[PDB]
């Protein structure tokens, strides 16, 4: 099957032509693609579970998070995630 390693993006809501997302690299490092508030730091995949970590700058604080989601689709071109009922649809940044 396809590997999750790569850059995954989606259109920026409300900003036509712009994209945002996450770059997942070999070695477990993840980084934000075109986002200022969400700072991704790592990823880990355990079967259909994806665990993403980083920090969120907001409400006068910087708070580390650990978000656990289900991988619903993973192909050479697409990655679809279910994060507690919110679906996230990404396309592979070529």
Give the domain CATH number at 10: 2.40.128.280
Domain that holds residue 87: 1-94
Number of H helices, E strands in the chain: 0, 8
Structural domain total, the chain? 1
**3-state SS, residue 34:** coil
Give me the residues paired with residue 45 across strands: 50
- The structure's method of determination equals X-ray
What is d(CA 22, CA 5) in angstroms, rounded to the nearest whole number? 10
> Are the beta carbons of 39 and 63 closer than 8 angstroms?
no
Resolution (A): 2.0
Q: What does DSSP assign to residue 12? A: P
In the block, which residue shows the tokens 């693609």?
A: 33
- By residue count, the chain amounts to 94
């Amino acid at each position: 099957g396809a590997s999750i390693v790569g850059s995954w993006v989606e259109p920026v809501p409300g900003l036509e032509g712009q994209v945002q997302g996450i770059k997942m690299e070999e070695g477990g490092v993840a980084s934000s693609v075109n986002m200022a508030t969400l700072v991704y730091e790592s990823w880990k995949q355990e079967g259909t579970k994806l665990i993403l970590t980083g920090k969120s700058i907001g409400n006068g604080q910087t708070i580390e998070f650990v978000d656990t989601m289900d991988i619903k689709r993973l192909t050479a071109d697409s990655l679809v995630l279910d994060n507690q009922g919110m679906e996230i649809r990404y396309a592979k940044q070529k």
